[PDB]
UniProtKB/Swiss-Prot annotation, chain A:
Domain notes per entry: Ectopic expression of the histone fold domain acts as a dominant-negative mutant resulting in differentiation inhibition.
Note: 'Taube nuss' means 'empty nut' in German.
Source organism (scientific name): Homo sapiens (Human)
Assembly, per entry: Component of the TFIID basal transcription factor complex, composed of TATA-box-binding protein TBP, and a number of TBP-associated factors (TAFs), including TAF1, TAF2, TAF3, TAF4, TAF5, TAF6, TAF7, TAF8, TAF9, TAF10, TAF11, TAF12 and TAF13. Interacts with TBP, TAF1, TAF6, TAF10, TAF11 and TAF13. Component also of a small TAF complex (SMAT) containing TAF8, TAF10 and SUPT7L. Forms a heterodimer with TAF10. Interaction with TAF10 is mediated mainly via its histone fold domain while interaction with SUPT7L is via its C-terminal region.
Residues of the full protein shown: 208 to 229 of 310
Protein name: Transcription initiation factor TFIID subunit 8
Coiled coil: none
Compartments where found: Nucleus; Cytoplasm
Swiss-Prot record, chain B:
UniProt disease link: Neurodevelopmental disorder with feeding difficulties, thin corpus callosum, and foot deformity: An autosomal recessive disorder characterized by impaired intellectual development, microcephaly, delayed psychomotor development, pyramidal signs, thin corpus callosum, and foot deformity.
Keyword match Transcription: yes
Phosphoprotein in keyword set: yes
Oligomer and partners: Component of the TFIID basal transcription factor complex, composed of TATA-box-binding protein TBP, and a number of TBP-associated factors (TAFs), including TAF1, TAF2, TAF3, TAF4, TAF5, TAF6, TAF7, TAF8, TAF9, TAF10, TAF11, TAF12 and TAF13. Interacts with TAF2C1. Component of the TFTC-HAT complex.
Protein name (database record): Transcription initiation factor TFIID subunit 2
GO molecular function, one term: RNA polymerase II general transcription initiation factor activity
Family: Belongs to the TAF2 family.
Extra facts: PubMed:9418870 was unable to show an association between TAF2 and TFIID.
GO BP terms: G2/M transition of mitotic cell cycle; mRNA transcription by RNA polymerase II; positive regulation of DNA-templated transcription; positive regulation of transcription initiation by RNA polymerase II; regulation of DNA repair; regulation of transcription by RNA polymerase II; RNA polymerase II preinitiation complex assembly; transcription initiation at RNA polymerase II promoter
Keywords: Disease variant, Intellectual disability, Nucleus, Phosphoprotein, Transcription, Transcription regulation
Function: The TFIID basal transcription factor complex plays a major role in the initiation of RNA polymerase II (Pol II)-dependent transcription. TFIID recognizes and binds promoters with or without a TATA box via its subunit TBP, a TATA-box-binding protein, and promotes assembly of the pre-initiation complex (PIC). The TFIID complex consists of TBP and TBP-associated factors (TAFs), including TAF1, TAF2, TAF3, TAF4, TAF5, TAF6, TAF7, TAF8, TAF9, TAF10, TAF11, TAF12 and TAF13. TAF2 forms a promoter DNA binding subcomplex of TFIID, together with TAF7 and TAF1.
Localization annotation: Nucleus
Length: 22, 968
């Protein structure tokens, strides 16, 4: 929790509308 | 000439009704228009899978019904012969029997004696079949956002992905290729959800006036069954403005991206009819984008249906090739998935030949004739690498007919009559050899004659199309290998049947020991070099060709070759190039300007060896020159081919600092992009050879100095360094090779480390209009190429130092970018992908411990493909080196169980490229039960698609190929 607390994965419903959105 | 297939066919009608999103099924009736060939044609066979028929009928007569699935397992489930060879042969014979290209049975409705006497009277019938696709478990796709309440209405789509003959898996037909028919197609659609298939919008108003709509697509143009596919749900954009009928379909909130994406298409159609001298031989062209692909390319009749990864919406520069690159394939194969058509699987190669070659011709006259040649070199890279991994990629006309084999290329599996035996490695290299054999047909025959041939092809085809069905006189659109060859020789009869029997019919790559000798080294013998070759395992002996040599400032000397290859040969000699302080430039190549006496120039009137710089013969050339000649070729040559091959040859051995000098000199001009990328990797290798010979500086910092002035750049280059795409790729590449620069004390790239961290600091605002994305990605990969294997001397894996020291800084940066792309996300989580590769390489040096649960949490369902695909590559190497049995079991269970095809494709592909459990090295004990489950997954659970069990065939190729697995 101190040095590197990476956010875990969300995984959500619709990936393409998110990852292909300027 | 003709088909050995009876019962000629004219027309067919589909009618999809009651398409479900909840129990997720489809019902429909088909009708077929048949002219039978001979009487007693009783057990009429069609073919499909995963199709519960509801009823069959011929003219209000439900006749008989036969329904087998030998595409499933062995007739005994415990046939203990659990090796390759029996399974390969048995499966080959099995699915050959599944094919109706013989008297066979999958759907043999028997004709009753009433209707048999009608056959004796009239061989004209109609066939009406009610049937229902279930949840499609290997034929179709119901892409569903996991909401199911309301967004199942707006947010889902439905289509058919599949391979060549997957029309079987969608609705019952023939051996689906090579049956010329025409179709009327009835589509029960939502009023919003638009369905797109072949043919034309022939009958649609607000249809049936009740709650929904219903579409009539009629394809009048006579085609075959493996072109038909229906994508249901997207949104219309005509992206017409230049050619008025170009039709595009994409999911909502994706639309203006097409407004950038789709254009340049008009230029492509302009190019293709500059080739073919026709029009786009159709009504319209239809294009569907989709979040999935069984295959990224996929191209059907008047319609290409492929992924929503290729939008490249106006700011995303690195898909400047790729998008229209793949669009090129989705037009060219279109035409030859249109009209020219294989008479058998063993007849195809001309198809993919001419299609891929045509879009190679596109790649000439669209961008980068030097990148065109670069692309050809990568083709040879793929082909040489694969047929030295494996056996040949052969283009049969020849059968093993009569239960015969005749297969030296059965190094794994069957090929002769069948698509569905092959690997994607094999099928890819099939297409690659297709490109290069059409280049050989350039090499014997005029491009103008190629235009002549193809125009004659399409003239005869388009003539033979679009008529009243000339009875018995119609199959001219099967334009396969033999008559095509005949038409070639009719245009110009040359000795191209030797070209066939060399390259079409001897699948062998040819290395070359053309051994450099040096006559006129003030020698009595004059300018001589010996020809040599022998290297079996996979060899081939090609004789009579020629040889291309550059003199000092003089003739491109070209010299014949022979078979019986213990040969010595001469050169059409240069002049006495003497007093060359005075002979400064006697015309090297045009008005090129160069002077060096730096080489061994007492008696060296030679400059460069070459065999066939236009890359005729499939080659892997091995020889030796003076290193001066290689470096001076890198001072200039008019071939990217020559430049990167001297890049490789000087990546092997040398380290003078003059090498470094000429490398950097090569990097700073207008020469070529990717030349400079491999030149960076040259500097990487050679400065890694500078441990005791650190003569030059800490390299390449001076290259960022002397090449990059923002505002004269007072010691650090920062800002806005784009719109000049030489510099774009070059800045994208160089710090990776800088992160390679290591000299053996602790390999110590500390200056480079801190420098790259500073590069990551100084990134730009929206002054760069270009989405500063991949630059981040490869700076991250440079950090991934800061491979430090040797910190943990004894046990330092386990939070001990909070492991130290620069590794932690790299961890800080990658942690930042992972959470930024969790927040920003910029374009496909491409940064996240490079990060995941970096984190695995950190596990491969034992700094963050070898634990998969991160990557496991990125192999999950609801992420992007590319994330998921890189996580699977990672966890595959995890199960390679680490011996995790359990996650392997998980992996195979997910190979069984997930909806996405392309992950199964790539799991099995790079699982086989990067295997654990490697054959005859069996420490992790596959013999226990893993062979059992693997044999099961070859048999069971894999009738979804062909290529999944083709990959399982590849698994048993690699893991314990040609034998018992040492179980019993």
């Amino acid at each position: 929790v101190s040095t590197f607390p990476l956010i875990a994965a969300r995984p959500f419903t619709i990936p393409y509308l998110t990852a292909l959105l300027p | 000439f003709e088909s050995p297939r009876p019962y000629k066919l004219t027309h067919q009608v589909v009618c999809i009704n009651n398409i479900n999103f909840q129990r997720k099924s489809v019902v429909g009736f088909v009708e077929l228009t048949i002219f039978p060939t001979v009487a007693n044609l009783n057990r009429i066979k069609l073919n499909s899978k995963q199709c519960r028929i509801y009823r069959v009928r011929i003219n209000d007569l439900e006749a008989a019904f036969i329904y087998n699935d030998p595409t499933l397992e062995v007739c005994h489930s415990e046939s203990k012969q659990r090796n390759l060879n029996y399974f390969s042969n048995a499966y080959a014979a099995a699915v050959s029997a599944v094919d109706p290209d013989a008297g066979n049975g999958e759907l043999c409705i028997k004709v009753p004696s009433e209707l048999w006497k009608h056959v004796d009277e009239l061989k004209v019938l109609k066939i009406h079949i009610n049937f229902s696709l279930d949840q499609p478990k290997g034929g179709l796709h119901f892409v569903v956002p996991s909401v199911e309440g309301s967004m199942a209405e707006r947010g889902a789509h439905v289509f058919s992905c599949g391979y060549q003959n997957s029309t079987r898996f969608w609705f019952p037909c023939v051996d689906s290729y090579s049956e010329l028919c025409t179709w009327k197609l009835e589509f029960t659609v939502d009023a919003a959800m638009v369905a797109v298939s072949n043919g034309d919008l022939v009958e649609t108003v607000y249809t049936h006036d009740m709650r929904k709509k219903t579409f009539h697509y009629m394809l009048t143009i006579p085609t075959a069954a493996s072109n038909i596919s229906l994508a249901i749900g997207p949104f219309e954009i005509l992206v017409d403005p230049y050619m008025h009928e170009v039709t595009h379909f994409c999911l909502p909130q994706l639309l203006p991206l097409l407004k950038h994406t789709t254009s340049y298409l008009h230029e492509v159609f302009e190019f293709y009819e500059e080739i073919l001298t026709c029009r786009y031989p159709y009504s319209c062209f239809k294009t569907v984008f989709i979040d999935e692909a069984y295959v990224e390319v996929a191209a059907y009749a008047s319609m290409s249906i492929f992924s929503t990864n290729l939008l490249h919406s106006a700011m995303i520069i690195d898909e400047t090739p790729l998008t229209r690159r793949c669009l090129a394939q989705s037009l060219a194969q279109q035409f030859f998935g249109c009209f020219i058509s294989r008479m058998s699987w063993s007849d195809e190669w001309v198809l993919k030949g001419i299609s891929g070659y045509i879009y190679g011709l596109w790649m000439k006259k669209t961008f980068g004739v030097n990148e065109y040649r670069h692309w050809i070199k990568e083709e040879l890279d793929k082909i040489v690498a694969y047929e030295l991994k494996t056996g040949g990629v052969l283009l049969h006309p020849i059968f093993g007919g009569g239960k015969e084999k005749d297969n030296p290329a059965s190094h794994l599996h069957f090929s002769i009559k069948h698509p569905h035996t092959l690997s994607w490695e094999y099928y890819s290299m099939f297409q690659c050899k297709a490109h290069l054999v059409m280049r050989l047909i350039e090499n014997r025959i005029s491009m103008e004659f190629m235009l002549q041939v193809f125009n004659k092809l399409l003239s005869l085809a388009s003539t033979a199309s679009s008529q009243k069905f000339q009875s018995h006189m119609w199959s001219q659109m099967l334009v396969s290998t033999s008559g095509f060859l005949k038409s070639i020789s009719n245009v110009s009869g040359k000795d191209i049947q030797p070209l066939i029997k060399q390259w079409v019919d001897q699948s062998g790559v040819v290395k070359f020991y053309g051994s450099f000798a040096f006559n006129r080294k003030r020698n009595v013998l004059e300018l001589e070099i010996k020809q040599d070759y022998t290297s079996p395992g996979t060899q081939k002996y090609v004789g009579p060709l020629k040889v291309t040599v550059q003199e000092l400032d003089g003739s491109f000397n070209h010299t014949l070759q022979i078979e019986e290859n213990s040969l010595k040969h001469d050169i059409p000699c240069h002049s006495k190039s003497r007093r060359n302080k005075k002979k400064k430039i006697p015309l090297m190549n045009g008005e090129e300007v160069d002077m060096d006496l730096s080489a061994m120039d007492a008696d060296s009137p030679l400059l460069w060896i070459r065999i066939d710089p236009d890359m005729s013969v499939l080659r892997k050339v091995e020889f030796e020159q003076a290193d001066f000649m290689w470096q001076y070729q890198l001072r200039y040559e008019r071939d990217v081919v020559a430049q990167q091959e001297s890049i490789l040859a000087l990546e092997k051995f040398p380290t003078p600092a003059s090498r470094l000098a000429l490398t950097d000199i090569l990097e700073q001009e207008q020469c070529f992009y990717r030349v400079r990328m491999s030149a960076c990797f040259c500097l990487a290798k050679i400065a890694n050879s500078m441990v005791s010979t650190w003569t030059g500086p800490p390299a390449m910092k001076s290259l960022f100095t002397r090449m990059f002035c923002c505002k004269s750049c007072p010691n650090i280059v920062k800002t806005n360094n784009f719109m000049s795409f030489q510099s774009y790729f070059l800045q994208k590449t160089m710090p990776v090779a800088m992160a390679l620069l290591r000299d053996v004390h602790n390999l110590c790239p500390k200056e480079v480390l801190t420098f790259i961290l500073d590069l990551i600091k100084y990134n730009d605002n929206r002054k760069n209009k270009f989405s500063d994305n991949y630059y981040r990605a490869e700076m991250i990969d440079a950090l991934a190429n800061s491979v430090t294997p040797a910190v943990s001397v004894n046990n330092e894996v386990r939070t001990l130092d909070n492991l130290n020291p620069d590794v932690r800084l790299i961890l800080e940066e990658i942690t930042r970018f992972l959470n930024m792309e969790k927040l920003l996300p910029s374009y496909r989580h491409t940064i996240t992908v490079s990060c995941l590769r970096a984190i695995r390489v950190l596990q491969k040096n034992g700094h963050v411990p070898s634990d998969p649960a991160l990557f496991k949490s990125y192999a999950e369902y609801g992420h992007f493909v590319d994330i998921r695909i890189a996580a699977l590559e990672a966890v595959v190497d995890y199960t390679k080196v680490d011996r995790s049995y359990e996650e392997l079991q998980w992996l195979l269970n997910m190979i069984q169980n997930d909806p996405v095809p392309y992950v199964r494709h790539k799991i099995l592909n790079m699982l086989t490229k990067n295997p654990p459990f490697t054959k005859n090295m069996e420490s992790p004990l596959c013999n226990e039960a893993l062979v059992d489950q693997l044999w099961k997954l070859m048999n069971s659970g894999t009738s979804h698609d062909w290529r999944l069990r083709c990959g399982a065939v590849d698994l048993y190729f690699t893991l314990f190929g040609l034998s018992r697995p040492s179980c019993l």
